[PDB]
Amino acid sequence: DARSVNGEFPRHVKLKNEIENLLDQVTQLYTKHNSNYQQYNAQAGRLDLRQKAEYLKGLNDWAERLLQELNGEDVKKVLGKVAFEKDDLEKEVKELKEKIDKKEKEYQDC
Amino acid sequence: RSVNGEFPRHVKLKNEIENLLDQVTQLYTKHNSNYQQYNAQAGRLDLRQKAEYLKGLNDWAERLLQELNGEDVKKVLGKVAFEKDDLEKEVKELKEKIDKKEKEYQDC
């Protein structure tokens, strides 16, 4: 057993371990989101309306943040910003190269 | 409206987490059955064909894994950050060239 197959068999095992680790992370997120609400219910009784909202909001905020970390949603928003600046800089570089070509024309004679 | 909308938000987050869990579970199942399929056909293939076959199965799984965990977006972010940095340095260099040209020919 444990052949190479041009490294593809060890790669199969590594991908299997990475998938299992993701499945474990998402399973614990799911389990904990559900138990968070059961815990809220248990402790909800002797909280006022405003404290109830602030408590359940805090639990929801913890789950949403962890989900966006696992699925890369957070990284996609940063990519959006950096891509917009990169696009503006590409247009600025084009404009400056055109300005340099015009300045060569401007001063061709002297 | 319903614990200030936090109860419906809990249910929404629950459905979004369950959808990710289902996607990762199907990816896991299919990666493992892909190998059982490979094992079944491995016998009748040469070394080159074995590598090409298992590589194709691995490529499928890795692409989907990197989609679900956002690794594909992180790699693209790395490249776009480096292109943005290169362009900022190119803007600076081009402005320097323009200022030098202007100074060179100020008497012209």
Residue numbers in the entry:
A (entry chain BBB): 4 to 113
B (entry chain CCC): 6 to 113
Direct quotes from the study:
The M protein is an essential virulence factor of *Streptococcus pyogenes*, or group A streptococcus (GAS), one of the most common and dangerous human pathogens. Encoded by the chromosomal *emm* gene, the M protein is covalently anchored at its C-terminus to the cell wall, covering the GAS surface at high density and acting as an adhesin and a potent immune evasion factor. To gain insights into mechanism and biological role of streptococcal collagen binding, we characterised the interaction of M3 with the Collagen Ligand Collections (CLCs, triple-helical collagen peptide libraries formerly known as Toolkits), and determined crystal structures of the M3 N-terminal domain (M3-NTD), encompassing the HVR, alone and in complex with a CLC-derived collagen peptide.
To stabilize a dimeric conformation, Leu151 was replaced with a cysteine for disulfide bond formation at the C-terminus. M3-NTD crystallized in several conditions with the best crystals diffracting X-rays to a resolution of 1.9 Å at the synchrotron radiation source. M3-NTD is a symmetrical homodimer, linked at the C-terminus by a disulfide bond ([Fig fig5]). The fold represents a novel T-shaped architecture with no significantly similar structures identifiable by the protein structure comparison server DALI. Helices H1 and H2 form hairpins that pack against each other to form the slightly kinked bar of the T-shape, effectively a three-helix bundle. A key residue is Gly113, which resides at the T-junction, separating H2 and H3 ([Fig fig5]). The T-bar structure is stabilized by a network of polar interactions of several conserved residues, most notably inter-chain salt bridges of Arg52 with Asp102 and Glu105, and an inter-chain hydrogen bond between the side chains of Glu49 and Asn101 ([Fig fig5]).
